[PDB]
Subunit: 121 residues, 8 copies
């Protein structure tokens, strides 16, 4: 199954980070979320109730990205993956990519991040 639903370049200002200074000042976190979902029925019917509502998916991502400051992006993505997989059965697998385009790293790069793929059980 190669159908997917996606939300790209989502950006939130948060205060997560392992370094105290990080959590104090904050920074923009960019997030790409790709969900595995079979879209033929919804494509057949044309009824939103046959697919996953992205607005709902964005609010779920936002709630975690703009919430309690944690240390790792790995934690930020695991909570997102695990939260989308719970409330949605049509999502067979959730891929969450988080990027810190401006970390406390002395150099010139486009960004540093992680990406996790999590199947729905």
């Amino acid at each position: 199954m190669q159908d997917t639903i996606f939300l790209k370049g989502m950006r939130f200002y948060g205060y997560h980070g392992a370094l105290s200074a990080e959590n104090e000042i904050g920074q923009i976190f960019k997030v790409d979320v790709t969900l595995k979902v079979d879209l033929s029925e919804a494509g057949r019917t044309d009824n939103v109730i046959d697919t996953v509502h992205y607005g709902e998916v964005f609010e779920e991502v936002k709630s975690i990205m703009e919430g309690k400051a944690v240390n790792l992006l790995e934690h930020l993505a695991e909570r997102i993956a695990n939260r989308i997989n719970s409330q949605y059965n049509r999502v067979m697998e959730t891929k969450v990519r988080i990027t810190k385009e401006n970390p406390p790293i002395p150099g010139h790069y486009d960004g540093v991040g992680i990406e996790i793929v999590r199947e729905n059980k």
Copy 2:
């Protein structure tokens, strides 16, 4: 077989959408279409009649994207996939990606959408 024919960043202004307000004002819909086709003969011959005409493929996408307002992008992509697969036998499979870069979602992201892959039967 890894040969493909493609049309990228296609953009149409339509009025599809589940919310009444959406259909009223409208918005730009971006579409990427990738077709699976064996291009060695056409590459051998150099005769357009040995490959698929993209102009024709674009008109087909345009006709659906600028037509009757439907609810889901899933419906918009299924009709595209199913319409390219019918009129072309050299297309072994059609991939349709639709993106709503500016949906009625309160936030900052690059865009939300879907992507369907459909083999030709």
Copy 3:
């Protein structure tokens, strides 16, 4: 005097707009603010108290951009100009540019907007 302080590509999701549908769904408003200020003293001293705090300027723009939905961008910019000019005497003139990159206009363009320049009295 050619010194300036600036905030660029500021983006807020609001519900301003002359059309009912607009105010209902909303959209991203991009704002560029350029303030006329003599920066030699601050450049001489290196004391923030000798210049204008942009954070404060951004909060002021944000408060208006994310507040009560009004009709015109002209109103949105006049309130910004008039609000920065009041609380800051070092600002000799305020330029406010607002852009609706995705208005309810059926077409292909990069964006529509306005720009006002207002001297401090």
Copy 4:
């Protein structure tokens, strides 16, 4: 007076051009329109009837850009300038920039064009 109303990166597919081949195949024409207008009243009132409607301005540009194929971009811009200046008295001056990003010129450049500034009489 430094207030302005603007429409940027407007893009239409037309068939204007001095060379026969040009008019036959066509190409994308990008247009930037900047109008001089005093926006304090509209900024004061918040009444669209105190400013110029861009939708109307875009339709006017579109009608000329997607109409009868002419030779020069200079003609395309003079008709735009002269047409916006007639139907709108609040526009004290109209600036029209047209760009041929892909002309029949053998080389590598970002685009070729013209720009005219026309006061309202």
Copy 5:
């Protein structure tokens, strides 16, 4: 084997095309070439003679892209693939992607093209 050598966004002005008008005026052709090559020896030694010279690969692409005007991009890519695979044994497979960002197609898209993958025999 996942090592690759690549040349991206290569751009040439040519006159290929099925339509007479096309061949007359011309247009920019963008080309991405990705070659499959085992790079551990060259990575071990650091001797250019243990890998494929891209300059040579670019000249080969250029010679075909700026040569005799043909009809299909499929022909343009097959000649490239077949020409790189002949003169280089370390290339186990050649992928050639050609894009017509501005074809004679009346619309708004980022570009139309093809992509062929060809193993070295």
Copy 6:
């Protein structure tokens, strides 16, 4: 008079440069040319013979940019300015901007260059 004719992002690979190594390997030179010309007649008539032919202007720039390797960009721009001003009387003034996006300078920047404005005598 605020009318202008322009050619932007023109790019040529040359070997100009004060350092021997520079002239040996070469580099891409980006050029923006803006000419002052009154376009109302051409806008009135629609006759190319009432304006300046950009193709001709591009060939003139190309001939100098892809010719004999000189030392300074200042020399490269003065020859361009002086060559466009001679063969065209409708050009009241020529502005030439040249950019070395990748000079032998150890650092991270978008580019270094010069810009000359030259009136037609």
Copy 7:
């Protein structure tokens, strides 16, 4: 006199900033420097000794941008302006623009900064 020499998008990682946390972690500072210089002689002669060496100008900017952490960007730009104006007499005026694309400001914008223009005495 409208001739200019320029260095754009220069980027350095520094630790300047009014807030302790800022100086601790650091951030990228983008700098645009535009110098007023008459380039006809250098354009006439083609002798680097008749113009200003940008490499030298970049090293001067770099030395200040990558040096002792100060509070204001206003101080960072005044030292740059004042340092280029001293060692170069052909520079009639120096414009320095500094941008903090990622300041400790909770929001979505492209960047905040200042710009100073300083004549050479």
Copy 8:
């Protein structure tokens, strides 16, 4: 396992290159590094000690990219791969992509490079 840690668009100015002139003047080298790592524990715990520190990974890349000038990018990437795989056991495989956006190649392209994938033994 599809989890990954990444560093993108990393840019260093070096003097590597097979041609003498290259090593003399230098150029910007862009590097993308993608490491295979299982991130569920770190995602579970939220303890940096359960994942790989990118800062450390960037310093390792920087040390090699800004060190002794070598001939091939293949050598530059093999040393990076082999150096990250040694000091980190959680990295099951390292992918290193290096790009020369501005090589001594006479033409117009976006960049030339290589990419190596190396498993950790």
